[PDB]
Amino acid sequence: PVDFTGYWKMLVNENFEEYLRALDVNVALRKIANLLKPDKEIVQDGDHMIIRTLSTFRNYIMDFQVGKEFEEDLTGIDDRKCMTTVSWDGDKLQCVQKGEKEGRGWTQWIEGDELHLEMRVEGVVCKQVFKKVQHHHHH
Ligand SMILES: Cc1ccc(C2(c3noc(CN(C)Cc4cnn(C)c4)n3)CCCC2)cc1
Numbered sequence: 545p546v547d548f549t550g551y552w553k554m555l556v557n558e559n560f561e562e563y564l565r566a567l568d569v570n571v572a573l574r575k576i577a578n579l580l581k582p583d584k585e586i587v588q589d590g591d592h593m594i595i596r597t598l599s600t601f602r603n604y605i606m607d608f609q610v611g612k613e614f615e616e617d618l619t620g621i622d623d624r625k626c627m628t629t630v631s632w633d634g635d636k637l638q639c640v641q642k643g644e645k646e647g648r649g650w651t652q653w654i655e656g657d658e659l660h661l662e663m664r665v666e667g668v669v670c671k672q673v674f675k676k677v678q679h680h681h682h683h
Pocket residue numbers: 564569573574577580582595597598599602603604606620621622650652661663
């Protein structure tokens with residue numbers, strides 16, 4: 545069992561620029577985005593997940609049901625739309641993002657007080673780790 549509910553602060557962000565490059569993100573935006581240390585506010589409500597990734601540049605909001613395919617609007621990220629499914633893989637969430645790019649997806653899991661997120665596209669891998677925090681941020 546796992547529960548992702550919480551407020552999470554970025555600790556590390558490894559290889560994000562190459563991940564965004566593989567998504568054809570403009571190098572100016574790659575540099576802006578890799579400077580960001582976003583927070584994540586997550587509510588797991590049964591199998592209804594809300595993952596709010598919050599930064600001073602752009603936010604990215606996910607709101608989906610585990611196991612149910614949906615249309616994911618990535619206009620703010622790489623100007624694409626995918627047909628996405630997030631599924632349980634034991635205590636991990638496994639996301640497949642079907643679309644133009646091959647091998648696009650991610651895996652999210654918890655180890656202790658750490659939220660781990662590995663994002664992948666076209667064989668390129670970015671790894672992020674967040675720490676669970678308790679001082680809440682008004683948004
Ligand atoms: C050109 C651009 C790059 C990156 C972003 C942000 C971004 N950083 O990552 C994501 C969404 N995906 C790529 C990764 C992800 C986040 N949560 N999950 C489960 C997967 N947007 C950084 C803070 C939020 C907006 C926004 C715009």
